[PDB]
Amino acid sequence: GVEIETISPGDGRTFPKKGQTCVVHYTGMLQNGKKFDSSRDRNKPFKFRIGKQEVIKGFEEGAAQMSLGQRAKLTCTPDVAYGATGHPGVIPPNATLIFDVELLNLE
């Protein structure tokens, strides 16, 4: 289940497709919890492409449901990211993830 809560401004037309490499200022958040990751702190804004299963599933579907300059708000189910296993030391099992995602990409 992908639930998009858009902070408005952008263009609404530059949709992410296959064969495109995209640049995202992500910020992870635990529901009823603190932060766990920040691209803003490293200031290396996470260049990646579409269609290689590099990112998790819940983040992958929310990427194409945005456009250039937009700012959504993700809400990922446990089964699409880590909830059966839990990422060791960082994500407990059966967890619900929150992301602040802005798409400032190229191509």
UniProtKB/Swiss-Prot annotation:
Main subcellular location of this protein, as a coarse class: cytoplasm
Reaction(s) this enzyme catalyzes, per UniProt: [protein]-peptidylproline (omega=180) = [protein]-peptidylproline (omega=0)
Tissue spec: Detected in heart muscle (at protein level). Isoform 1 and isoform 2 are ubiquitous with highest levels in brain and thymus.
GO cellular component terms given for this protein: calcium channel complex; cytoplasm; membrane; sarcoplasmic reticulum membrane; Z disc
GO molecular function: calcium channel inhibitor activity; calcium channel regulator activity; FK506 binding; peptidyl-prolyl cis-trans isomerase activity; signaling receptor binding; transmembrane transporter binding
Activity regulation summary: Inhibited by both FK506 and rapamycin.
Subcellular location: Cytoplasm; Sarcoplasmic reticulum
Keywords: Cytoplasm, Isomerase, Rotamase, Sarcoplasmic reticulum
Protein EC: 5.2.1.8
GO BP term, pick one: protein refolding
InterPro entries: FKBP-type_PPIase (IPR050689), PPIase_dom_sf (IPR046357), PPIase_FKBP_dom (IPR001179)
Protein family according to the UniProt entry: Belongs to the FKBP-type PPIase family. FKBP1 subfamily.
Assembly description: Identified in a complex composed of RYR2, FKBP1B, PKA catalytic subunit, PRKAR2A, AKAP6, and the protein phosphatases PP2A and PP1. Interacts directly with RYR2.
Function description: Has the potential to contribute to the immunosuppressive and toxic effects of FK506 and rapamycin. PPIases accelerate the folding of proteins. It catalyzes the cis-trans isomerization of proline imidic peptide bonds in oligopeptides.
Name of the featured protein: Peptidyl-prolyl cis-trans isomerase FKBP1B
Record organism: Homo sapiens
Taxon lineage: Eukaryota, Metazoa, Chordata, Craniata, Vertebrata
Gene name as annotated: FKBP1B
